[PDB]
Amino acid sequence: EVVKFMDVYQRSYCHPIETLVDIFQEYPDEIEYIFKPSCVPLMRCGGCCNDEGLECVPTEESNITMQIMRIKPHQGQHIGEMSFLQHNKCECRPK
Amino acid sequence: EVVKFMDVYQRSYCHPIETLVDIFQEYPDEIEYIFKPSCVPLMRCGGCCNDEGLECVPTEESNITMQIMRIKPHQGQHIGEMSFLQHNKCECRPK
Protein backbone atom coordinates (compact mmCIF):
# COMPACT_ATOMS: atom_id res chain seq x y z
CA GLU A 1 0.00 0.00 0.00
CA VAL A 2 1.01 3.58 -0.70
CA VAL A 3 2.07 5.75 2.27
CA LYS A 4 0.05 8.95 2.10
CA PHE A 5 1.70 12.35 1.77
CA MET A 6 0.49 13.74 5.13
CA ASP A 7 1.71 10.55 6.89
CA VAL A 8 5.14 10.72 5.26
CA TYR A 9 5.33 14.35 6.34
CA GLN A 10 4.21 13.67 9.90
CA ARG A 11 6.50 10.60 10.45
CA SER A 12 9.55 12.33 8.96
CA TYR A 13 9.32 15.74 10.68
CA CYS A 14 12.21 16.71 13.00
CA HIS A 15 11.77 14.63 16.18
CA PRO A 16 13.83 12.50 18.60
CA ILE A 17 14.29 8.99 17.18
CA GLU A 18 16.16 5.88 18.33
CA THR A 19 19.45 6.10 16.50
CA LEU A 20 22.41 3.70 16.58
CA VAL A 21 25.49 5.85 17.17
CA ASP A 22 29.04 4.56 16.88
CA ILE A 23 30.84 5.00 20.25
CA PHE A 24 34.07 6.05 18.53
CA GLN A 25 32.06 9.04 17.17
CA GLU A 26 30.96 10.17 20.69
CA TYR A 27 34.52 9.69 22.07
CA PRO A 28 36.61 10.62 18.99
CA ASP A 29 39.83 11.01 21.06
CA GLU A 30 39.98 7.40 22.40
CA ILE A 31 43.30 6.20 20.90
CA GLU A 32 43.48 3.29 23.40
CA TYR A 33 40.15 1.36 23.70
CA ILE A 34 38.04 -0.74 21.32
CA PHE A 35 34.37 -0.89 22.36
CA LYS A 36 31.93 -3.77 22.44
CA PRO A 37 29.21 -3.20 21.40
CA SER A 38 30.78 -0.64 19.03
CA CYS A 39 27.51 1.37 18.80
CA VAL A 40 24.68 2.33 21.17
CA PRO A 41 20.93 3.12 20.87
CA LEU A 42 20.42 6.82 21.69
CA MET A 43 17.46 9.17 21.22
CA ARG A 44 18.73 11.81 18.84
CA CYS A 45 17.31 14.41 16.52
CA GLY A 46 16.44 13.12 13.12
CA GLY A 47 14.21 14.00 10.24
CA CYS A 48 13.87 17.11 8.19
CA CYS A 49 12.57 20.64 8.31
CA ASN A 50 10.21 22.57 6.03
CA ASP A 51 12.82 25.06 4.74
CA GLU A 52 16.39 24.12 3.68
CA GLY A 53 17.50 27.18 5.67
CA LEU A 54 16.25 25.41 8.80
CA GLU A 55 18.02 22.41 10.43
CA CYS A 56 16.89 19.92 13.04
CA VAL A 57 18.59 20.47 16.44
CA PRO A 58 18.06 19.55 20.10
CA THR A 59 16.44 21.93 22.58
CA GLU A 60 16.35 19.67 25.67
CA GLU A 61 19.28 17.28 26.36
CA SER A 62 20.02 14.65 29.03
CA ASN A 63 22.69 11.99 29.82
CA ILE A 64 22.33 8.22 29.81
CA THR A 65 24.92 5.78 31.21
CA MET A 66 25.54 2.35 29.70
CA GLN A 67 27.85 -0.59 30.49
CA ILE A 68 30.25 -1.13 27.59
CA MET A 69 33.03 -3.65 27.22
CA ARG A 70 36.29 -1.73 26.82
CA ILE A 71 39.19 -3.64 25.30
CA LYS A 72 42.78 -2.49 25.10
CA PRO A 73 44.07 -4.96 22.50
CA HIS A 74 46.75 -7.32 23.90
CA GLN A 75 46.51 -5.47 27.24
CA GLY A 76 43.17 -6.33 28.95
CA GLN A 77 39.48 -5.65 29.11
CA HIS A 78 36.70 -4.69 31.48
CA ILE A 79 33.14 -3.47 31.60
CA GLY A 80 32.90 0.29 32.11
CA GLU A 81 30.08 2.74 32.58
CA MET A 82 30.09 5.29 29.75
CA SER A 83 27.89 8.34 29.40
CA PHE A 84 26.16 9.47 26.21
CA LEU A 85 24.10 12.54 25.29
CA GLN A 86 20.41 12.02 24.48
CA HIS A 87 17.92 14.46 22.89
CA ASN A 88 14.60 14.79 24.75
CA LYS A 89 13.15 17.52 22.50
CA CYS A 90 14.11 18.78 19.03
CA GLU A 91 13.02 21.79 17.00
CA CYS A 92 13.70 23.30 13.60
CA ARG A 93 15.99 26.33 14.05
CA PRO A 94 17.68 28.68 11.56
CA LYS A 95 21.23 27.82 10.49
CA GLU B 1 19.59 4.19 35.73
CA VAL B 2 22.45 2.34 34.10
CA VAL B 3 21.71 0.31 30.94
CA LYS B 4 23.10 -3.18 31.49
CA PHE B 5 25.76 -4.66 29.24
CA MET B 6 23.62 -7.53 27.88
CA ASP B 7 20.79 -5.06 27.09
CA VAL B 8 23.11 -2.68 25.27
CA TYR B 9 24.41 -5.64 23.30
CA GLN B 10 20.96 -7.00 22.48
CA ARG B 11 19.43 -3.59 21.47
CA SER B 12 22.43 -2.63 19.32
CA TYR B 13 22.98 -5.89 17.42
CA CYS B 14 22.57 -5.76 13.61
CA HIS B 15 18.81 -5.55 12.95
CA PRO B 16 16.31 -3.62 10.79
CA ILE B 17 15.53 -0.25 12.40
CA GLU B 18 13.40 2.75 11.41
CA THR B 19 15.87 5.09 9.79
CA LEU B 20 15.27 8.54 8.29
CA VAL B 21 16.92 8.50 4.86
CA ASP B 22 17.41 11.59 2.72
CA ILE B 23 15.58 11.13 -0.63
CA PHE B 24 18.42 12.78 -2.56
CA GLN B 25 20.60 9.87 -1.30
CA GLU B 26 18.23 7.20 -2.73
CA TYR B 27 17.89 9.11 -6.05
CA PRO B 28 21.40 10.67 -6.33
CA ASP B 29 20.93 11.51 -10.05
CA GLU B 30 17.88 13.82 -9.65
CA ILE B 31 19.29 17.12 -10.99
CA GLU B 32 15.76 18.54 -11.47
CA TYR B 33 13.48 17.98 -8.41
CA ILE B 34 13.51 19.16 -4.78
CA PHE B 35 11.59 16.81 -2.46
CA LYS B 36 9.19 17.54 0.36
CA PRO B 37 9.54 15.92 2.82
CA SER B 38 13.28 15.72 2.01
CA CYS B 39 13.67 12.43 3.96
CA VAL B 40 11.60 9.28 4.54
CA PRO B 41 11.22 6.66 7.33
CA LEU B 42 12.55 3.33 6.00
CA MET B 43 13.42 0.05 7.73
CA ARG B 44 17.12 -0.38 7.12
CA CYS B 45 19.99 -2.34 8.58
CA GLY B 46 21.63 -0.71 11.52
CA GLY B 47 23.73 -1.65 14.48
CA CYS B 48 26.98 -3.45 14.77
CA CYS B 49 28.53 -6.88 14.50
CA ASN B 50 30.73 -8.88 16.88
CA ASP B 51 33.88 -8.80 14.71
CA GLU B 52 35.17 -5.70 12.86
CA GLY B 53 35.70 -8.03 9.88
CA LEU B 54 31.92 -8.50 9.77
CA GLU B 55 29.45 -5.80 8.56
CA CYS B 56 25.70 -5.49 8.88
CA VAL B 57 23.88 -6.10 5.55
CA PRO B 58 20.38 -6.97 4.31
CA THR B 59 19.38 -10.52 3.41
CA GLU B 60 15.68 -9.94 2.59
CA GLU B 61 14.61 -6.73 0.78
CA SER B 62 11.26 -5.26 -0.32
CA ASN B 63 9.89 -2.02 -1.89
CA ILE B 64 7.63 0.59 -0.31
CA THR B 65 5.90 3.41 -2.22
CA MET B 66 5.28 6.84 -0.71
CA GLN B 67 3.65 10.08 -1.91
CA ILE B 68 6.25 12.85 -2.02
CA MET B 69 5.88 16.44 -3.10
CA ARG B 70 8.21 17.01 -6.05
CA ILE B 71 9.11 20.61 -6.81
CA LYS B 72 10.94 21.87 -9.86
CA PRO B 73 11.90 25.34 -8.62
CA HIS B 74 10.24 28.16 -10.62
CA GLN B 75 8.65 25.49 -12.87
CA GLY B 76 5.90 23.65 -10.92
CA GLN B 77 5.11 20.97 -8.39
CA HIS B 78 3.05 17.85 -7.85
CA ILE B 79 2.65 14.87 -5.59
CA GLY B 80 4.33 11.76 -6.98
CA GLU B 81 4.57 8.15 -5.90
CA MET B 82 8.21 7.23 -5.25
CA SER B 83 9.61 3.82 -4.42
CA PHE B 84 12.22 3.08 -1.76
CA LEU B 85 14.09 -0.06 -0.73
CA GLN B 86 13.37 -1.51 2.73
CA HIS B 87 15.29 -4.21 4.66
CA ASN B 88 13.10 -6.99 6.11
CA LYS B 89 15.99 -9.09 7.50
CA CYS B 90 19.65 -8.28 8.19
CA GLU B 91 22.62 -10.45 9.09
CA CYS B 92 26.29 -10.03 9.87
CA ARG B 93 28.33 -11.13 6.83
CA PRO B 94 32.07 -11.07 6.06
CA LYS B 95 33.41 -8.02 4.20
Epitope: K36, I71, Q75, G76, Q77, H78, I79 | -
Partner: antibody
Protein backbone atom coordinates in the same frame (compact mmCIF):
# COMPACT_ATOMS: atom_id res chain seq x y z
CA UNK C 1 35.26 -31.13 20.72
CA UNK C 2 37.54 -28.27 21.69
CA UNK C 3 40.65 -29.68 23.39
CA UNK C 4 44.31 -29.09 24.30
CA UNK C 5 46.81 -31.91 24.73
CA UNK C 6 50.21 -31.21 26.28
CA UNK C 7 53.32 -33.34 25.84
CA UNK C 8 57.02 -33.26 26.43
CA UNK C 9 57.42 -33.06 30.20
CA UNK C 10 59.54 -35.26 32.37
CA UNK C 11 62.77 -35.26 34.32
CA UNK C 12 65.55 -32.80 33.48
CA UNK C 13 68.83 -31.89 35.20
CA UNK C 14 69.45 -28.46 36.70
CA UNK C 15 70.71 -26.09 33.98
CA UNK C 16 69.02 -28.26 31.33
CA UNK C 17 66.43 -27.61 28.68
CA UNK C 18 63.01 -28.99 27.84
CA UNK C 19 60.41 -28.24 25.16
CA UNK C 20 56.68 -28.59 25.92
CA UNK C 21 54.07 -29.01 23.20
CA UNK C 22 50.40 -28.26 23.15
CA UNK C 23 48.13 -29.54 20.37
CA UNK C 24 44.81 -27.72 19.80
CA UNK C 25 41.75 -29.54 18.32
CA UNK C 26 38.31 -28.14 17.45
CA UNK C 27 39.43 -24.53 17.05
CA UNK C 28 42.10 -22.48 15.24
CA UNK C 29 44.78 -21.02 17.57
CA UNK C 30 44.99 -18.04 15.13
CA UNK C 31 41.79 -16.74 16.83
CA UNK C 32 43.26 -17.11 20.28
CA UNK C 33 45.82 -16.37 22.91
CA UNK C 34 47.61 -19.50 24.10
CA UNK C 35 48.92 -19.42 27.67
CA UNK C 36 51.10 -21.59 29.89
CA UNK C 37 50.25 -21.74 33.57
CA UNK C 38 52.18 -23.78 36.12
CA UNK C 39 51.60 -25.15 39.58
CA UNK C 40 54.53 -26.04 41.85
CA UNK C 41 53.67 -28.97 44.20
CA UNK C 42 51.13 -27.86 46.86
CA UNK C 43 51.33 -24.21 45.64
CA UNK C 44 49.03 -21.83 43.69
CA UNK C 45 48.57 -21.28 39.98
CA UNK C 46 51.25 -19.09 38.36
CA UNK C 47 50.77 -17.57 34.92
CA UNK C 48 54.07 -17.99 32.99
CA UNK C 49 53.71 -17.04 29.28
CA UNK C 50 51.39 -16.04 26.43
CA UNK C 51 51.49 -16.02 22.63
CA UNK C 52 49.27 -14.37 20.04
CA UNK C 53 49.95 -16.84 17.21
CA UNK C 54 49.18 -14.67 14.14
CA UNK C 55 51.78 -11.98 14.90
CA UNK C 56 53.98 -14.01 17.26
CA UNK C 57 53.67 -11.46 20.14
CA UNK C 58 54.87 -12.93 23.42
CA UNK C 59 54.65 -11.97 27.11
CA UNK C 60 56.40 -13.67 30.05
CA UNK C 61 56.30 -13.61 33.84
CA UNK C 62 59.43 -12.12 35.48
CA UNK C 63 60.24 -15.47 37.06
CA UNK C 64 60.90 -17.05 33.60
CA UNK C 65 61.63 -14.07 31.30
CA UNK C 66 64.90 -14.59 29.40
CA UNK C 67 64.93 -18.36 30.10
CA UNK C 68 61.66 -19.48 28.49
CA UNK C 69 60.35 -18.94 24.99
CA UNK C 70 56.74 -19.42 23.89
CA UNK C 71 55.84 -19.92 20.23
CA UNK C 72 53.05 -21.19 18.01
CA UNK C 73 52.91 -22.96 14.66
CA UNK C 74 49.56 -21.92 13.12
CA UNK C 75 49.79 -24.59 10.39
CA UNK C 76 50.17 -27.46 12.95
CA UNK C 77 47.68 -25.75 15.35
CA UNK C 78 50.31 -26.28 18.08
CA UNK C 79 51.98 -24.11 20.72
CA UNK C 80 55.35 -24.69 22.37
CA UNK C 81 57.22 -23.60 25.49
CA UNK C 82 61.01 -23.84 25.24
CA UNK C 83 62.49 -23.90 28.72
CA UNK C 84 66.12 -23.16 29.22
CA UNK C 85 68.30 -23.00 32.36
CA UNK C 86 66.03 -24.90 34.67
CA UNK C 87 66.13 -24.75 38.41
CA UNK C 88 64.47 -26.57 41.31
CA UNK C 89 61.82 -23.75 41.48
CA UNK C 90 60.61 -24.58 37.91
CA UNK C 91 59.48 -28.02 39.07
CA UNK C 92 55.71 -27.94 38.57
CA UNK C 93 52.78 -29.21 36.57
CA UNK C 94 52.62 -27.14 33.39
CA UNK C 95 49.30 -26.39 31.82
CA UNK C 96 48.39 -25.11 28.43
CA UNK C 97 45.25 -22.96 28.27
CA UNK C 98 43.26 -21.03 25.73
CA UNK C 99 41.68 -17.60 25.83
CA UNK C 100 39.51 -16.25 22.90
CA UNK C 101 39.42 -12.61 21.60
CA UNK C 102 36.89 -9.78 22.03
CA UNK C 103 33.57 -11.29 23.14
CA UNK C 104 35.41 -14.57 23.18
CA UNK C 105 37.77 -13.39 25.82
CA UNK C 106 36.18 -14.45 29.06
CA UNK C 107 38.55 -16.81 30.73
CA UNK C 108 40.46 -20.02 30.42
CA UNK C 109 37.77 -22.40 29.50
CA UNK C 110 39.96 -24.93 27.85
CA UNK C 111 42.96 -26.45 29.63
CA UNK C 112 45.16 -29.39 28.89
CA UNK C 113 45.55 -32.24 31.38
CA UNK C 114 48.88 -30.87 32.73
CA UNK C 115 52.43 -32.21 32.28
CA UNK C 116 54.81 -32.67 35.28
CA UNK C 117 58.30 -31.18 34.85
CA UNK C 118 60.79 -32.27 37.52
CA UNK C 119 64.13 -30.50 37.79
CA UNK C 120 66.51 -32.82 39.65
CA UNK C 121 69.88 -34.56 39.16
CA UNK D 1 49.88 -4.10 36.38
CA UNK D 2 47.50 -5.22 39.13
CA UNK D 3 47.83 -8.03 41.67
CA UNK D 4 44.77 -9.61 43.26
CA UNK D 5 44.71 -10.42 46.94
CA UNK D 6 42.36 -13.26 47.63
CA UNK D 7 40.83 -14.07 50.94
CA UNK D 8 40.44 -16.13 53.00
CA UNK D 9 43.34 -18.47 52.53
CA UNK D 10 41.26 -21.41 53.73
CA UNK D 11 37.87 -21.99 55.28
CA UNK D 12 35.70 -24.74 56.58
CA UNK D 13 31.95 -24.81 56.06
CA UNK D 14 28.96 -27.21 56.31
CA UNK D 15 26.80 -28.64 53.52
CA UNK D 16 24.05 -26.05 52.77
CA UNK D 17 26.10 -23.06 53.99
CA UNK D 18 26.85 -19.85 52.12
CA UNK D 19 30.56 -19.56 51.29
CA UNK D 20 31.98 -16.15 50.36
CA UNK D 21 35.43 -15.71 48.81
CA UNK D 22 36.95 -12.31 48.14
CA UNK D 23 39.40 -10.85 45.60
CA UNK D 24 40.84 -7.29 45.97
CA UNK D 25 42.82 -5.38 43.27
CA UNK D 26 46.10 -3.68 44.30
CA UNK D 27 45.45 -0.40 42.44
CA UNK D 28 42.62 2.09 42.94
CA UNK D 29 39.86 1.40 40.37
CA UNK D 30 36.58 3.28 40.36
CA UNK D 31 33.16 1.68 41.03
CA UNK D 32 32.19 2.47 37.40
CA UNK D 33 34.54 -0.32 36.28
CA UNK D 34 33.53 -3.95 36.66
CA UNK D 35 33.62 -7.27 34.82
CA UNK D 36 37.39 -7.96 34.83
CA UNK D 37 37.62 -11.02 37.18
CA UNK D 38 37.21 -14.72 36.38
CA UNK D 39 36.82 -17.48 39.00
CA UNK D 40 38.06 -21.07 38.75
CA UNK D 41 37.55 -24.27 40.71
CA UNK D 42 40.49 -26.67 40.91
CA UNK D 43 40.04 -30.19 42.26
CA UNK D 44 43.33 -31.63 43.51
CA UNK D 45 45.71 -32.58 40.68
CA UNK D 46 43.18 -31.64 37.91
CA UNK D 47 42.99 -28.65 35.58
CA UNK D 48 41.04 -25.66 36.90
CA UNK D 49 37.48 -25.19 35.60
CA UNK D 50 35.94 -21.84 34.78
CA UNK D 51 32.96 -20.96 37.00
CA UNK D 52 32.38 -17.23 36.57
CA UNK D 53 33.56 -14.78 33.90
CA UNK D 54 33.35 -11.02 33.50
CA UNK D 55 32.82 -10.60 37.25
CA UNK D 56 29.27 -11.95 37.45
CA UNK D 57 28.41 -14.26 34.50
CA UNK D 58 27.81 -17.94 35.10
CA UNK D 59 29.75 -20.14 32.69
CA UNK D 60 27.84 -22.79 30.73
CA UNK D 61 27.04 -26.00 32.60
CA UNK D 62 28.03 -24.67 36.05
CA UNK D 63 25.43 -25.16 38.76
CA UNK D 64 23.54 -21.98 39.63
CA UNK D 65 24.52 -22.04 43.32
CA UNK D 66 27.73 -20.34 42.06
CA UNK D 67 27.53 -16.58 41.52
CA UNK D 68 29.88 -13.64 41.47
CA UNK D 69 29.81 -9.91 41.74
CA UNK D 70 32.02 -6.89 42.10
CA UNK D 71 33.09 -3.50 40.97
CA UNK D 72 35.99 -1.10 41.50
CA UNK D 73 38.63 -3.08 43.36
CA UNK D 74 36.36 -5.63 45.14
CA UNK D 75 35.08 -8.95 43.77
CA UNK D 76 33.23 -11.79 45.39
CA UNK D 77 32.54 -15.44 44.58
CA UNK D 78 29.53 -16.91 46.40
CA UNK D 79 28.48 -20.50 46.74
CA UNK D 80 24.90 -20.26 47.99
CA UNK D 81 24.35 -23.87 49.04
CA UNK D 82 27.60 -25.65 49.66
CA UNK D 83 27.73 -29.21 48.38
CA UNK D 84 30.25 -31.98 49.21
CA UNK D 85 31.55 -31.86 45.59
CA UNK D 86 32.45 -28.20 46.11
CA UNK D 87 35.59 -29.25 48.01
CA UNK D 88 38.37 -27.62 45.98
CA UNK D 89 40.78 -24.70 45.80
CA UNK D 90 39.15 -21.62 44.21
CA UNK D 91 41.19 -19.02 42.30
CA UNK D 92 40.40 -15.57 40.96
CA UNK D 93 42.04 -14.06 37.91
CA UNK D 94 42.17 -10.43 36.68
CA UNK D 95 42.37 -9.35 33.04
CA UNK D 96 42.03 -5.61 33.67
CA UNK D 97 45.67 -5.40 32.73
CA UNK D 98 47.04 -8.47 31.13
CA UNK D 99 49.03 -10.70 31.37
CA UNK D 100 46.28 -12.11 33.56
CA UNK D 101 47.42 -12.87 37.12
CA UNK D 102 45.85 -15.25 39.62
CA UNK D 103 45.01 -14.83 43.27
CA UNK D 104 46.71 -17.14 45.81
CA UNK D 105 43.65 -19.38 46.17
CA UNK D 106 41.12 -20.24 48.80
CA UNK D 107 41.03 -23.86 49.98
CA UNK D 108 37.45 -24.87 50.85
CA UNK D 109 37.04 -27.78 53.29
CA UNK D 110 33.62 -29.34 53.91
CA UNK D 111 32.78 -29.57 57.58
CA UNK D 112 30.79 -32.72 58.27
Amino acid sequence: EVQLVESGGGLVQPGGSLRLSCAASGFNIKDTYIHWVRQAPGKGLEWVARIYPTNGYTRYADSVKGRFTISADTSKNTAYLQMNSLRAEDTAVYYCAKLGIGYYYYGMDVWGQGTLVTVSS
Amino acid sequence: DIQMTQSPSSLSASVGDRVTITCRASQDIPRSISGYVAWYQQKPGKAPKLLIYWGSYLYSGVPSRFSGSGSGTDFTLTISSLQPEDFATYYCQQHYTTPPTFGQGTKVEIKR
